[PDB]
């Protein structure tokens, strides 16, 4: 899979994108990689933020589905016109498939001023596709029309340019150390998982585990932060505050209202605690844990940083803060997600991100919200 290594680019806070082509002859576009949605949607009009856009009038293979799609989401919206066309990934498998493409014709707070991407590749499942589950997601078409195995993995590396790898149809063993540990995909809509225990510097938060997954937990390459349900965010911050009490920061810092800065090269990593999420394992009463560093949850912006853990009303979102520590395998074929220590995660000489197990955890099914 050497061809696919380093096929992801981005800027901090603006997501990870992959090069794709659409139409005949192929039109090159950079596309945001998003495991937290299920539509392939591309700029199709000359929005001033866009480097380029899909021009259907130049594609001999374009087919108009004669249907609109209207996709408001939490932080923005896009609307467009559904069709199909030939789609390939130059630094992906050597294949081309006919996929659904939403040609974006109106939008608000969707495109980022200064970004280098023009569209969005929703890698999650048909259940949450717009307008409905009859609109086959890209990855489903890829697997259905080719021999590409039904899995992909992401290595997101971070720093200001970021980079990473999207391995389509496989696992590249050079991208991780130690073993992969798998947690079940609870339901095929989002990439939903179940967190069964939370530790700050090894100290259990001692919350009812349902709270950790209220109303769901998801693995989301399209979110920068680790987002936590309100009640869990309260406890997490209280514990991280206590752990980091050597140095006092404004209350706003913890809420993402302001940045904290240190002299270039003297960030006190060691006063900040590690954060461990235990995930439901593959076997009854068995779990594993993934552990991230402040290198992951304190994000560059003197060296100044943003606290990149935040409260949610939509459940836990394991965003880039989690994923940048790990090689993450979206094993759709076996309805499971693998975690392993990432060969590229940022760390120091004292601590590294970790994936460890097995542990004994009882009543893990009670942790899921219904
Ligand atoms: C890592 C990272 C990142 C990142 C940084 N800046 C902006 C984005 C971004 C841009 C457009 C965008 C989305 C994110 C976003 C929001 O969260 C996720 N997972 N995808 C998104 C989600 C949706 C959805 C439509 C229907 O429900 C599911 C999600 N539609 C459009 C979207 O556009 C991602």
UniProtKB/Swiss-Prot annotation:
It comes from the Eukaryota. Residues 1-370 are extracellular. Inhibited by RTN3 and RTN4. The active site is at residues 34, 220. Disulfide bonds join 157-344, 209-367, 261-304. Glycans are attached at residues 94, 113, 285. Responsible for the proteolytic processing of the amyloid precursor protein (APP). Cleaves at the N-terminus of the A-beta peptide sequence, between residues 671 and 672 of APP, leads to the generation and extracellular release of beta-cleaved soluble APP, and a corresponding cell-associated C-terminal fragment which is later released by gamma-secretase. Cleaves CHL1. The modification N6-acetyllysine is found at residues 67, 206, 210, 216, 230-231, 238. GO terms for cellular component: axon; cell surface; dendrite; early endosome; endoplasmic reticulum lumen; endosome; endosome membrane; Golgi apparatus. It comes from Homo sapiens. N-Glycosylated. Addition of a bisecting N-acetylglucosamine by MGAT3 blocks lysosomal targeting, further degradation and is required for maintaining stability under stress conditions. Acetylated in the endoplasmic reticulum at Lys-67, Lys-206, Lys-210, Lys-216, Lys-230, Lys-231 and Lys-238. Acetylation by NAT8 and NAT8B is transient and deacetylation probably occurs in the Golgi. Acetylation regulates the maturation, the transport to the plasma membrane, the stability and the expression of the protein. Belongs to the peptidase A1 family. Its EC number is 3.4.23.46. Its main location: membrane. The keyword Transmembrane applies. The gene is BACE1. It catalyses: Broad endopeptidase specificity. Cleaves Glu-Val-Asn-Leu-|-Asp-Ala-Glu-Phe in the Swedish variant of Alzheimer's amyloid precursor protein. It is found in: Cell membrane; Golgi apparatus, trans-Golgi network; Endoplasmic reticulum; Endosome. GO terms for molecular function: amyloid-beta binding; aspartic-type endopeptidase activity; beta-aspartyl-peptidase activity; endopeptidase activity; enzyme binding; peptidase activity; protein serine/threonine kinase binding. Expressed at high levels in the brain and pancreas. In the brain, expression is highest in the substantia nigra, locus coruleus and medulla oblongata. This is Beta-secretase 1. Residues 16-340 form the Peptidase A1 domain. It is a single-pass type I membrane protein. The chain holds residues 60 to 446 of 501 of the full protein. Induction: Up-regulated by the Ca(2+)-regulated transcription factor NFATC4. Keywords: Acetylation, Aspartyl protease, Cell membrane, Cell projection, Cytoplasmic vesicle, Disulfide bond, Endoplasmic reticulum, Endosome, Glycoprotein, Golgi apparatus, Hydrolase, Isopeptide bond, Lipoprotein, Lysosome, Membrane, Palmitate, Phosphoprotein, Protease, Signal, Transmembrane, Transmembrane helix, Ubl conjugation, Zymogen. Monomer. Interacts with RTN1; RTN2; RTN3 and RTN4; the interaction leads to inhibition of amyloid precursor protein processing. Interacts with SNX6. Interacts with PCSK9. Interacts with NAT8 and NAT8B. Interacts with BIN1. Interacts (via extracellular domain) with ADAM10 (via extracellular domain). Interacts with SORL1; this interaction may affect binding with APP and hence reduce APP cleavage. Interacts with NRDC AND NRG1. It is an enzyme of class 3 (hydrolase).
């Amino acid at each position: 899979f050497v061809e696919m290594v380093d096929n992801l680019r981005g800027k901090s806070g603006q997501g990870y994108y992959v090069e794709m082509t659409v139409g005949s002859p192929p039109q090159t576009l950079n596309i945001l990689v998003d495991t937290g949605s299920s539509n392939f949607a591309v700029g199709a009009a000359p929005h001033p933020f866009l480097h380029r856009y899909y021009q259907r009038q130049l594609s001999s293979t374009y087919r108009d589905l004669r249907k609109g799609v209207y996709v408001p989401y939490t932080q923005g919206k896009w609307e467009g016109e559904l069709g199909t066309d030939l789609v390939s990934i130059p630094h992906g498998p050597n294949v081309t498939v006919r996929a659904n493409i939403a040609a974006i014709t109106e939008s608000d707070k969707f495109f980022i001023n200064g970004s280098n991407w023009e569209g969005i590749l929703g890698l999650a499942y048909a259940e949450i596709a717009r307008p409905d589950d009859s609109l086959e997601p890209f990855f489903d078409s890829l697997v259905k029309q080719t021999h590409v195995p039904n899995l992909f993995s992401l290595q997101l590396c971070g720093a200001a340019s970021v980079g990473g790898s999207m391995i389509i149809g496989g696992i590249d063993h050079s991208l991780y150390t130690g073993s992969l540990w798998y947690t079940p995909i609870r339901r095929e809509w989002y990439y939903e998982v179940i967190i069964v225990r939370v530790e700050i510097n090894g100290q259990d938060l001692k919350m009812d585990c349902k709270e950790y997954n209220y109303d769901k937990s998801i693995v989301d390459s399209g979110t920068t932060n680790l987002r936590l349900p309100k009640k869990v965010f309260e406890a997490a911050v209280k514990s991280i505050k206590a752990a980091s009490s050597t140095e006092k920061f404004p209350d706003g810092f913890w809420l993402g209202e302001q940045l904290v800065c240190w002299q270039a090269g003297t960030t006190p990593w060691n006063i900040f605690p590690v954060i461990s999420l235990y995930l439901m394992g593959e076997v009854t009463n068995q779990s594993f844990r993934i552990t991230i560093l402040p290198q992951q949850y304190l994000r560059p912006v003197d060296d100044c940083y943003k606290f990149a853990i935040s409260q949610s009303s939509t459940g836990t979102v394991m965003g880039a803060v989690i994923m940048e520590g790990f090689y993450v395998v979206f094993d759709r074929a076996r309805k499971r997600i693998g975690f392993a220590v990432s060969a590229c995660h940022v760390h120091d000489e004292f601590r590294t991100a970790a994936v460890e197990g097995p542990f004994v955890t009882l009543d893990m099914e009670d942790c899921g919200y219904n």
